[PDB]
Design a protein around this ligand. Structure first.
Ligand SMILES: OC[C@@H]1O[C@@H](OC[C@@H]2O[C@@H](OC[C@@H]3O[C@@H](OC[C@@H]4O[C@@H](OC[C@@H]5O[C@@H](OC[C@@H]6O[C@@H](O)[C@H](O)[C@H]6O)[C@H](O)[C@H]5O)[C@H](O)[C@H]4O)[C@H](O)[C@H]3O)[C@H](O)[C@H]2O)[C@H](O)[C@H]1O
Ligand SMILES: [Ca+2]
Length: 318
């Protein structure tokens, strides 16, 4: 399943000196035609576009206003900022997942919107509100935010999500609804194993016979004091057990650190990983120490070593 398509594009041949409107947190990317799209956290889900992948402009948003049903799930929410979108392309349809929540609480719902095209100029454009996907309340020990969809080796879709509480959750989706399958059960597949369980934002990819689970550790959303980092583990089965490069279980704080940030780019996290041919990129945000800690889009080539583990090189100089 080519659920994140990018064409003949070779990410290792592009110079990723990003320009333009770069302010963002919790970014994902998609490409339709020759146009690239970044979906990120903000009013009604915020959208940027680019004709090359490198020069970005703010383009629009997914919802003019919050869908009405959301209030039932999160009655205390009184603004229209939707969090941590995820995008995938399946059966000719775009499935956009997003989070409705309030900060520090686990009364939350993940919604689904669908579209035939990502382009508002295209007369087929219409984000159909397909309603709720999965939710959490105070009686749950997980938080229904931060969705991610992955396809397993048998082409079955799966949803991972989570933030704090018991950690990262996983549940099988139905291929028709792209919502959790009838009697499907929620599994916890990662956790720091203790309090406060600062693990969130899962992103799963399948490469060379392993599922790789990327996550963010520690604390976002504090500008220049954010302590966010990007960590990774892997499993032969999508249901786990996920283990880091040192063999430590990701259900016990395991995870190899991919990026902990530098003197400029503080607290990198909420990442997404995409492939095109034999190339890959990591997408995330980081808090800009030279611009008042403002969350900033980052896109970098991501390499894989001979043992199958991902790694980043030093930042180029521009
Ligand atoms: O930048 C300017 C503005 O941003 C944009 O508008 C919307 C904003 O983006 C949102 O951030 C994205 C989300 O951030 C991550 O998770 C955030 C929170 O972390 C957890 O809460 C943190 C903390 O711990 C809580 O308690 C922990 C649990 O309680 C125990 O019982 C349990 O055992 C513990 O584990 C505390 O209450 C709290 O202090 C929460 O899970 C989550 O709320 C998500 O991953 C991202 O989705 C930001 O918040 C929005 O306002 C605009 O563009 C711009 O104006
Ligand atoms: Ca995500």
């Amino acid at each position: 399943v080519h659920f994140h398509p990018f064409g003949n594009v070779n990410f290792y041949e592009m110079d990723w000196s990003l320009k333009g409107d770069l302010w963002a947190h919790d970014p994902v990317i998609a490409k339709e035609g020759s146009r690239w799209y970044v979906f990120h956290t903000g009013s009604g889900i915020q959208i940027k576009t680019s004709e090359d992948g490198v020069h970005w402009e703010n383009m629009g948003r997914v919802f003019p206003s919050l869908p009405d049903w959301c209030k039932q799930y999160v009655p205390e929410k009184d603004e229209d900022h939707l969090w941590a979108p995820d995008i995938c392309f399946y059966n000719g349809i775009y499935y956009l997942y997003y989070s409705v929540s309030t900060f520090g609480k686990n009364t939350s719902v993940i919604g689904l919107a669908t579209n035939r095209t990502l382009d508002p100029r295209d007369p087929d454009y219409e984000w159909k509100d397909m309603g709720p996907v999965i939710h959490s309340t105070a009686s749950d020990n997980y938080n229904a935010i931060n969705p991610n969809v992955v396809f397993d080796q048998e082409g079955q879709p799966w949803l991972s999500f989570g933030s704090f509480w018991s950690g990262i959750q996983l549940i099988q989706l139905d291929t028709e609804t792209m919502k959790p399958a009838a009697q499907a059960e929620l599994l916890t597949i990662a956790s720091r194993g203790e309090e406060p369980n600062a693990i969130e934002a899962p992103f799963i990819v399948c490469r060379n016979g392993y599922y790789y689970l990327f996550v963010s550790f520690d604390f976002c959303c504090r500008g220049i004091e954010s302590t966010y980092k990007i960590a990774v583990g892997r499993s032969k089965d999508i249901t786990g057990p996920y283990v880091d490069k040192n063999g430590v279980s990701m259900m016990q704080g395991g995870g190899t650190i991919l990026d902990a940030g530098n003197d400029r780019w503080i607290g990198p996290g909420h990442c997404a990983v995409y492939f095109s041919g034999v190339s890959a990129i990591l997408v995330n945000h980081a808090y800009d120490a030279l611009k008042n800690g403002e969350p900033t889009l980052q896109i970098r080539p991501l390499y894989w070593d001979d043992e199958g583990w991902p790694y980043l090189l030093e930042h180029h100089h521009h």
